[PDB]
Design a protein around this motif. Structure first.
Motif, PDB file in Angstrom:
ATOM      1  N   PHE A   2      -1.772  -4.775 -10.662  1.00 30.55           N
ATOM      2  CA  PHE A   2      -1.787  -4.756  -9.227  1.00 30.55           C
ATOM      3  C   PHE A   2      -2.385  -3.436  -8.770  1.00 30.55           C
ATOM      4  CE2 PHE A   2       0.519  -3.375  -5.475  1.00 30.55           C
ATOM      5  CZ  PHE A   2       0.005  -4.253  -4.587  1.00 30.55           C
ATOM      6  N   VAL A   3      -1.973  -2.364  -9.389  1.00 33.94           N
ATOM      7  CA  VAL A   3      -2.454  -1.045  -8.999  1.00 33.94           C
ATOM      8  C   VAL A   3      -3.947  -0.842  -9.360  1.00 33.94           C
ATOM      9  CG1 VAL A   3      -1.968   1.425  -9.036  1.00 33.94           C
ATOM     10  CG2 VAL A   3      -0.118  -0.195  -9.027  1.00 33.94           C
ATOM     11  N   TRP A   4      -4.421  -1.409 -10.468  1.00 34.78           N
ATOM     12  CA  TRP A   4      -5.863  -1.429 -10.750  1.00 34.78           C
ATOM     13  C   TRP A   4      -6.619  -2.144  -9.677  1.00 34.78           C
ATOM     14  CZ3 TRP A   4      -8.522   1.873 -13.109  1.00 34.78           C
ATOM     15  CH2 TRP A   4      -8.038   2.513 -14.243  1.00 34.78           C
ATOM     16  N   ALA A   5      -6.159  -3.339  -9.314  1.00 35.09           N
ATOM     17  CA  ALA A   5      -6.691  -4.079  -8.184  1.00 35.09           C
ATOM     18  C   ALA A   5      -6.800  -3.241  -6.940  1.00 35.09           C
ATOM     19  CB  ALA A   5      -5.882  -5.333  -7.918  1.00 35.09           C
ATOM     20  N   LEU A   6      -5.738  -2.515  -6.569  1.00 33.59           N
ATOM     21  CA  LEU A   6      -5.776  -1.660  -5.379  1.00 33.59           C
ATOM     22  C   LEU A   6      -6.858  -0.564  -5.516  1.00 33.59           C
ATOM     23  CD1 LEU A   6      -4.583  -0.315  -2.701  1.00 33.59           C
ATOM     24  CD2 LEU A   6      -2.914   0.803  -4.304  1.00 33.59           C
ATOM     25  N   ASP A   7      -7.129  -0.110  -6.750  1.00 31.51           N
ATOM     26  CA  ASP A   7      -8.093   1.006  -6.916  1.00 31.51           C
ATOM     27  C   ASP A   7      -9.424   0.586  -6.322  1.00 31.51           C
ATOM     28  OD1 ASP A   7     -10.519   2.092  -8.963  1.00 31.51           O
ATOM     29  OD2 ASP A   7      -9.008   3.581  -8.377  1.00 31.51           O
ATOM     30  N   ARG A  40      -5.255   7.006 -17.579  1.00 26.32           N
ATOM     31  CA  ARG A  40      -6.432   6.881 -16.707  1.00 26.32           C
ATOM     32  C   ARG A  40      -5.984   6.505 -15.282  1.00 26.32           C
ATOM     33  N   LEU A  41      -5.047   5.546 -15.231  1.00 26.51           N
ATOM     34  CA  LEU A  41      -4.479   5.046 -13.992  1.00 26.51           C
ATOM     35  C   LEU A  41      -3.756   6.125 -13.233  1.00 26.51           C
ATOM     36  CD1 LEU A  41      -4.257   2.653 -12.119  1.00 26.51           C
ATOM     37  CD2 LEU A  41      -2.323   1.901 -13.574  1.00 26.51           C
ATOM     38  N   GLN A  42      -2.928   6.924 -13.908  1.00 23.87           N
ATOM     39  CA  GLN A  42      -2.224   8.020 -13.236  1.00 23.87           C
ATOM     40  C   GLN A  42      -3.235   8.987 -12.625  1.00 23.87           C
ATOM     41  OE1 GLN A  42       1.507   9.668 -14.802  1.00 23.87           O
ATOM     42  NE2 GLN A  42       1.380   8.117 -16.455  1.00 23.87           N
ATOM     43  N   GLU A  43      -4.395   9.177 -13.286  1.00 22.61           N
ATOM     44  CA  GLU A  43      -5.349  10.150 -12.743  1.00 22.61           C
ATOM     45  C   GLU A  43      -6.032   9.497 -11.538  1.00 22.61           C
ATOM     46  OE1 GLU A  43      -5.221  13.201 -12.937  1.00 22.61           O
ATOM     47  OE2 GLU A  43      -6.958  13.873 -11.821  1.00 22.61           O
ATOM     48  N   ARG A  44      -6.275   8.186 -11.616  1.00 17.13           N
ATOM     49  CA  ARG A  44      -6.918   7.457 -10.496  1.00 17.13           C
ATOM     50  C   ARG A  44      -6.008   7.391  -9.239  1.00 17.13           C
ATOM     51  NH1 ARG A  44     -11.346   5.162 -13.617  1.00 17.13           N
ATOM     52  NH2 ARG A  44     -12.997   4.784 -12.066  1.00 17.13           N
ATOM     53  N   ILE A  45      -4.695   7.216  -9.476  1.00 24.49           N
ATOM     54  CA  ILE A  45      -3.688   7.335  -8.381  1.00 24.49           C
ATOM     55  C   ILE A  45      -3.734   8.715  -7.710  1.00 24.49           C
ATOM     56  CG2 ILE A  45      -1.293   7.341  -7.676  1.00 24.49           C
ATOM     57  CD1 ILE A  45      -0.832   5.222 -10.088  1.00 24.49           C
ATOM     58  N   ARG A  46      -3.680   9.782  -8.528  1.00 22.01           N
ATOM     59  CA  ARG A  46      -3.716  11.125  -7.975  1.00 22.01           C
ATOM     60  C   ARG A  46      -4.917  11.396  -7.110  1.00 22.01           C
ATOM     61  NH1 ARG A  46      -1.427  11.910 -11.967  1.00 22.01           N
ATOM     62  NH2 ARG A  46      -2.860  12.840 -13.501  1.00 22.01           N
ATOM     63  N   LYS A  47      -6.049  10.935  -7.560  1.00 16.10           N
ATOM     64  CA  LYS A  47      -7.315  11.269  -6.888  1.00 16.10           C
ATOM     65  C   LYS A  47      -7.373  10.416  -5.603  1.00 16.10           C
ATOM     66  CE  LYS A  47     -10.066  12.006 -11.062  1.00 16.10           C
ATOM     67  NZ  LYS A  47     -11.217  11.543 -11.886  1.00 16.10           N
ATOM     68  N   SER A  48      -6.845   9.186  -5.665  1.00 13.78           N
ATOM     69  CA  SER A  48      -6.938   8.311  -4.448  1.00 13.78           C
ATOM     70  C   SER A  48      -6.007   8.866  -3.404  1.00 13.78           C
ATOM     71  CB  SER A  48      -6.535   6.882  -4.766  1.00 13.78           C
ATOM     72  OG  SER A  48      -7.606   6.292  -5.466  1.00 13.78           O
ATOM     73  N   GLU A  49      -4.853   9.391  -3.826  1.00 13.30           N
ATOM     74  CA  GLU A  49      -3.976  10.054  -2.895  1.00 13.30           C
ATOM     75  C   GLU A  49      -4.589  11.318  -2.314  1.00 13.30           C
ATOM     76  OE1 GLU A  49       0.015  10.532  -4.432  1.00 13.30           O
ATOM     77  OE2 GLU A  49       0.267   8.322  -4.549  1.00 13.30           O
ATOM     78  N   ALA A 101       4.382   0.149  -3.036  1.00 17.81           N
ATOM     79  CA  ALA A 101       5.403   0.314  -4.077  1.00 17.81           C
ATOM     80  C   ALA A 101       4.861  -0.239  -5.418  1.00 17.81           C
ATOM     81  CB  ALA A 101       6.662  -0.392  -3.630  1.00 17.81           C
ATOM     82  N   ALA A 102       4.888   0.566  -6.445  1.00 19.06           N
ATOM     83  CA  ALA A 102       4.412   0.127  -7.771  1.00 19.06           C
ATOM     84  C   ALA A 102       5.454   0.611  -8.750  1.00 19.06           C
ATOM     85  CB  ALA A 102       3.041   0.767  -8.074  1.00 19.06           C
ATOM     86  N   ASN A 103       6.121  -0.352  -9.404  1.00 25.57           N
ATOM     87  CA  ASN A 103       7.214  -0.085 -10.299  1.00 25.57           C
ATOM     88  C   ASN A 103       8.288   0.690  -9.517  1.00 25.57           C
ATOM     89  OD1 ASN A 103       8.280  -0.311 -12.900  1.00 25.57           O
ATOM     90  ND2 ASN A 103       7.857   1.865 -13.375  1.00 25.57           N
ATOM     91  N   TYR A 104       8.571   0.204  -8.304  1.00 26.06           N
ATOM     92  CA  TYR A 104       9.518   0.860  -7.395  1.00 26.06           C
ATOM     93  C   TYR A 104      10.833   0.109  -7.482  1.00 26.06           C
ATOM     94  CZ  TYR A 104      11.967   2.465  -3.350  1.00 26.06           C
ATOM     95  OH  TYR A 104      12.997   2.933  -2.613  1.00 26.06           O
ATOM     96  N   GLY A 105      11.988   0.820  -7.430  1.00 22.71           N
ATOM     97  CA  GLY A 105      13.233   0.118  -7.111  1.00 22.71           C
ATOM     98  C   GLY A 105      14.056   1.049  -6.281  1.00 22.71           C
ATOM     99  N   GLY A 106      14.842   0.478  -5.356  1.00 26.42           N
ATOM    100  CA  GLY A 106      15.666   1.289  -4.452  1.00 26.42           C
ATOM    101  C   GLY A 106      16.687   2.185  -5.232  1.00 26.42           C
TER     102      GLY A 106
END
Ligand SMILES: O=C(Nc1ccc(C2=NCCN2)cc1)c1ccc(C(=O)Nc2ccc(-c3ncc[nH]3)cc2)c([N+](=O)[O-])c1
Ligand SMILES: O=C(Nc1ccc(C2=NCCN2)cc1)c1ccc(C(=O)Nc2ccc(-c3ncc[nH]3)cc2)c([N+](=O)[O-])c1
Lengths: 211, 217
Positions: free
Chosen positions: B66-71, B96-105, B119-124
Motif C-alpha cells: 500500500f505504501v509503495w502504491a502511495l509513493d 529502501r521504503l523507509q528512505e522513500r517515506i523520509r524523503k516524501s515527508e 496510517a501504515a502498520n498503525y494501531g491505536g
C-alpha cells in the motif's frame, strides 16, 4: 456470545425535562433502569457489565449505590468501582472498599461502576505505575509492550469488552473506555437511559450477534 | 473554522473487498477503485477547508505494498500543496521504503494546504505504547519524574499531537467498530458509520458526514 457489555448511560436529564419534572426525578428513573439492566445481564449469562454514569455528583451517585450492596451480594454479583476515588471523602472510600471486599469472592456477574472515571485517566494511571517501575530500576523502557500496559489498566482480569452501548442519542465515546474498546462493537441508540429496557438491551445484543 | 466546524477528519476506509465481490471481480479491482476514492476524498477535504485528514486503509475482507502504491502519488500530492505524513510502525519496512517515506515527508513538509496522514502498520494501542516508551526513557535518564506524568504530557507524545484534535471519525463499509485505529485521540470525536462501501463513498457522502457533524455539534 457477548461476555462483557459496557454502557454509557446518557439521557437522564433530557428525560426529566421531557417528563416536565426537575433533574432529580430523572436520576431516580435512571436508577430504576440500572437495576433492570443489571438484572437482565445477570439473567442472560453476561459475565461483566461496566456502567458509566454520564450526562450530556459522582460521590452521591456512589452513595446511592451503597444501599444496593446487600442485594447484589445475595445475587452472587462481584461489585467494583473503577475511576479516581482518591479524593472522595474518606468515609465513602471506606464504604467502597468494604463493598468491594464483601463481594470480591462472588462468581456471578461482575458489575463495574465507573465513578469519576476517564479513559485517558485510566491509561495515565497505568503509565504512572510503569514509570515508578522504571525509576526503581525494576523495568527497562523498552520491555514495555501492549500486553504489559494492558496489565496495568482497568479490568484487565475480565473478558475483553465485546459491546459498548450508548443511550441518549450522542455518537461519541466521551472519554469512557479507550484502551479497552479497540475491538468492541459500538451500538448507539436514541432511547434515553430511563427508558432503555430489556428489549432495547436485546436489540444491542443482536447487533453484536449479526456482526 | 469552516461552516461545517471540522478541522480534522479521520476515515476507516473499509469495503474495497466487498465492493469487488459484488461486481464479480478479484480484490485488486476493489483496491484500484478504493484508490480512486482516496484521490476524490483528499481533493474534497482540501477544497473544503479541512486542516487534516487521517486515512486508515483497512479491509474487513501487504501494508508495505500500500505504501509503495502511495509513493507514486507523492508528486501529485506535492503539486496540490498537501503536507504528507505516514503514522504507524514503519521501522521493519524495507530499507529502501523507509528512505522513500523520509524523503516524501521532507519534500512536502513545507506545504500549506491539507495535512494528510496515512496510517501504515498503525494501531491505536501501538501509538499509546510508543508514547509511553518515550516517557519511560525520559524517566530512566532522570529527566522526568513519574508523578509529573499527566494526560497533557502523554498527549504530547502520541501521533498527531501537534495537529487539531480529531473532530469526526467516518467508517465506511457497514461495521460499527474502531478496529484499533485511533484510540487516545478519539476520546471526544463524533463517530459516523455508513454502510456505503469505500469505493462508492463520494463527495456528497463526505458532505453528508461533515454536515451531520455540524448539526450534531
Ligand atoms: O444507581 C443506582 N441507584 C441510585 C439511586 C438514586 C440515585 C440518585 N441520584 C440522585 C438522585 N437519585 C442514583 C442512583 C443503582 C440502583 C440499583 C442498583 C442495583 O443494581 N440494584 C440491584 C439489585 C439487585 C439486582 C439483581 N437482581 C438479579 C441480579 N441482580 C440488580 C440490581 C445499582 N447498582 O448498581 O447496583 C445502582
Ligand atoms: O491508495 C492509493 N493508491 C493505491 C493504489 C493501489 C493500491 C493497491 N493496493 C493493492 C492493489 N493496488 C493501493 C493504494 C492512493 C491513491 C491516491 C492518493 C491521493 O490522494 N492522490 C491524490 C493525487 C492528486 C490529488 C489532487 N491533485 C489536484 C486535485 N487533487 C489528490 C489526491 C492517495 N493518497 O493517499 O493520497 C493514495
Amino acid at each position: 456470545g457477548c461476555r462483557h457489555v459496557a454502557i454509557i448511560m446518557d439521557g437522564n436529564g433530557r428525560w426529566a425535562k421531557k417528563q416536565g419534572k426537575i433533574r432529580a426525578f430523572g436520576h431516580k428513573a435512571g436508577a430504576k433502569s440500572v437495576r433492570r439492566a443489571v438484572s437482565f445481564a445477570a439473567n442472560n449469562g453476561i459475565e461483566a457489565l461496566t456502567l458509566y454514569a454520564f450526562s450530556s455528583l459522582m460521590e452521591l451517585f456512589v452513595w446511592a449505590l451503597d444501599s444496593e450492596v446487600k442485594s447484589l451480594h445475595r445475587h452472587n454479583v462481584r461489585l467494583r468501582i473503577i475511576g479516581d476515588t482518591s479524593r472522595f471523602n474518606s468515609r465513602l472510600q471506606e464504604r467502597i472498599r468494604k463493598s468491594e471486599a464483601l463481594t470480591a469472592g462472588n462468581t456471578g456477574l461482575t458489575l463495574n461502576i465507573a465513578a469519576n472515571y476517564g479513559g485517558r485517566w485510566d491509561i495515565v494511571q497505568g503509565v504512572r505505575q510503569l514509570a515508578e517501575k522504571v525509576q526503581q530500576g525494576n523495568l527497562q523502557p523498552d520491555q514495555i509492550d501492549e500486553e504489559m500496559l494492558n496489565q496495568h489498566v482497568c479490568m484487565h482480569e475480565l473478558a475483553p469488552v465485546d459491546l459498548v452501548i450508548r443511550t441518549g442519542g450522542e455518537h461519541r465515546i466521551s472519554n469512557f473506555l479507550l484502551w479497552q474498546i479497540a475491538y468492541a462493537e459500538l451500538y448507539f441508540t436514541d432511547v434515553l437511559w430511563p427508558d432503555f429496557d430489556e428489549q432495547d438491551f436485546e436489540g444491542a445484543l443482536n447487533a453484536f450477534a449479526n456482526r
